[PDB]
């Protein structure tokens, strides 16, 4: 296992120098991927080459097949058999398939296709997260919002392995996926995160609550005190969303005192491993230089839906290592994983 070559094989077996090289290395990769070897470089393991290891790259025969498939794709591609067919294409096909195929049949199918498209053709993109640690690989998840509601959130993702000469392949993008969770975030603070290899949303919302009575006699409270609740929810394999988990983040938000019309910046990224989520709050600045030596609050959320406060000694580390991911006024940044 160490030398990646078998010293117990009979002499009856024939090989070539290249063939053994493509064996010792295959073992090397498998031991690293299976975590037999304790500390592989996570920034290498995450590369797309390894992501595809179990489908194509681990074998010569499948590697060669794919390499030809994508070198001369014109010999294999087909409108009826392709990757990324949209749900709206399914709608066209189901309508077309009900009758004779001709121009009129497709015209009606297209009108349905296009109206379905229009509804999500221009959502406002609110926020996003990259699930890799390198910006050239992995996926960016986005949250968008219909101009017609405060609800109607949709998620979308893009595959960066399909990004090359300044542009993305058309099927690098997913469709918009409706979120059925009744999310009512404060100041559009919501940010997606990939955690436990699932898509989670987290956001702050204010719970408007106060004492109904003023001085406990003749008098009243004005409107509300604002309790900041951090909600966390995820996608089920049903495609639907579950009920959010609520966390108390009020002391953190008050320490980082903001004005009345502000939301704390919500920094969130997954720790590369251990199903540990890093949540930080900050008083959003005009420039990234203001985060240098800034005071930040935060908490760790574990797979067991429980949390611990970050001690400032550590929150300062994440602050220093992860800045330039923090939002400032007039920009929005896509966060990424922390390794």
């Amino acid at each position: 296992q160490y030398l990646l070559i078998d010293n117990q094989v009979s002499a009856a077996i024939k090989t070539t120098r290249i063939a053994e090289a493509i064996a010792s290395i295959q073992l090397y990769v498998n031991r690293a991927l299976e975590n037999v070897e304790e500390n592989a470089n996570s920034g290498v393991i995450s590369r797309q080459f390894f992501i595809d290891w179990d489908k194509y790259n681990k074998r010569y025969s499948t590697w060669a097949g794919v390499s030809q498939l994508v070198y001369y794709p014109e010999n294999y591609i087909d409108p009826t058999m392709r990757i990324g067919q949209t749900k709206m294409m399914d709608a066209l096909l189901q309508s077309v398939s009900q009758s004779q195929l001709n121009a009129d049949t497709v015209e009606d199918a297209f009108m349905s296709y296009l109206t379905s498209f229009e509804q999500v053709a221009n959502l406002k993109v609110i926020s996003a997260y990259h699930d890799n640690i390198n910006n050239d690989q992995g996926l960016t998840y986005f949250i968008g919002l219909s101009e017609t509601d405060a609800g109607e959130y949709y998620w979308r993702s893009v595959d960066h392995s399909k990004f090359n000469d300044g542009k993305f392949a058309a099927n690098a993008w997913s469709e918009w996926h409706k979120i059925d969770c009744p999310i009512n975030p404060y100041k559009s603070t919501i940010r997606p995160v990939i955690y436990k290899s699932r898509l989670y949303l987290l956001w702050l919302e204010q719970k408007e609550i106060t004492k109904q009575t003023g001085n406990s006699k003749d008098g009243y409270q004005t409107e509300t005190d604002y309790r900041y609740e951090l909600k966390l929810a995820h996608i089920r394999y049903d495609g639907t969303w579950n009920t959010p988990i609520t966390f108390d983040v009020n002391k953190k938000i008050s320490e980082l005192k903001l004005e009345k019309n502000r939301a704390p910046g919500l920094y969130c990224a997954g720790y590369q491993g251990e199903d540990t989520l890093l949540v930080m709050f900050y008083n959003q600045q005009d420039t990234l230089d203001s985060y240098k030596n800034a005071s930040m609050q935060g908490l760790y959320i574990f797979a067991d839906m429980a949390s611990k406060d970050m001690t400032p000694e550590q929150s300062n580390v994440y602050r220093d290592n992860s800045y330039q991911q923090f939002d400032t006024n007039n920009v929005r940044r896509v966060n990424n994983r922390y390794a």
């Binding site: 994508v70 014109e74 591609i77 409108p79 195929l101 001709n102 296709y113 296009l114 300044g166």
Partner: protein, 506 residues
Amino acid sequence: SIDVTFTAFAEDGRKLGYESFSIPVTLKVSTDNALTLHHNENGAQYMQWQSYRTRLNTLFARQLVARATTGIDTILSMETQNIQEPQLGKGFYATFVIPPYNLSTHGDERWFKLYIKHVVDNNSHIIYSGQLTDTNINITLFIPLDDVPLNQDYHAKVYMTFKKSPSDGTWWGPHFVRDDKGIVTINPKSILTHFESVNVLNNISSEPMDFSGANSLYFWELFYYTPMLVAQRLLHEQNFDEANRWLKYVWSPSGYIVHGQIQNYQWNVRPLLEDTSWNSDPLDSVDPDAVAQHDPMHYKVSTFMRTLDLLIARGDHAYRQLERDTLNEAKMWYMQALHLLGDKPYLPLSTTWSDPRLDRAADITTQTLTDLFLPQINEVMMNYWQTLAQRVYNLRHNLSIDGQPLYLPIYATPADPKALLSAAVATSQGGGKLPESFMSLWRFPHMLENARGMVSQLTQFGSTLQNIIERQDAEALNALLQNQAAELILTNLSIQDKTIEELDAE
């Protein structure tokens, strides 16, 4: 670092000695840049992360819907694909014309690359890549600018490398400067040696529907995959003429007529018309449609092959009728396919190989051949000449499609008119469409039983559908009745209020 001290003592407590070690621990974080989201004033949304900006939305979905109400020919027109979107951010469009391949310069290899520098950093980025053809390659690029330029002589630099002269010298590419009022000009200190021409498209603030944007997938289904899908099904059904008509929506050799005018193009899908050169640096994927739709040349070729498949199929259909007249028809179809293919290209094989060490072989591209390894022939495409040559050979040698001798009479036996009539009558019913009655190896009673089983299954789906429909209507009625009840109660509530008012009047 961890401070590790080794020490020992004697039985009587005397120290024996010590050694101190230090184990360094280094922590790395991939402190990359962040992708940035923007929403501009013109309504465009984009993701910017380098010099690269990706369009995230469309502002004309309403127009597509409206155009579709006028028919297939309006939704699939070229004009539809010219609906413009606002530019993403500060920057400008420019037209670059890349000179034809020659061996005085650009010698040895046909690849070239264009790079953009000094936009967000002093590092360069690939902006465009492709292989040189024997003509002028005319491309339009959007050149993004940062609000605050890296250089004061120019806001951005674009340069070309092509194996020869990959130097990025100062002033070797055009240097672009943004003047007041947003007018971008080329700084005269720069030169155009590697370009045929460069034109800044001042006052262009928009561009035609972006097939590289976030919603491009819908545009590719709308303009390319659907008409190709339709043509495929029509061909399977042997509607050869209809399949032809549908392929023509994507590619029409001889061109198109637009608003009565004769056009100068064959490709009717904007990205196939554009992107006339092969991408010299292909997408590293496992998905062939990620590669196609990245480099549109692949669809142009598959479209070409589908056209040939249609011509060949028309040929084979005729061939198989085994009548001298239909063999002659088959012959023209194969000739049309050969005409369209043209000459088989000569593809020499190279024997040059450096036997490089693996470490050196592991030569990569990031952000005596350039590419150490060479491609193979692509037998699938070469086989079109091989196939046609055999089919034509057989016709010229009086052989069947599978190479058997045949002895057809010179003059065909007259078709029996009673059969011609029943076929004509079956056809002229209205509709009348029936598939070719393929002859199977099975005797009548076998096929009869299979057909009976198939039909009884059809009658089961039929009754199932009828029950769904009747139940569907029943549901609609119950909903209607409750919606009506909801209205009458409101009127009754108003009546009751009037009764209460009457009593107050009492």
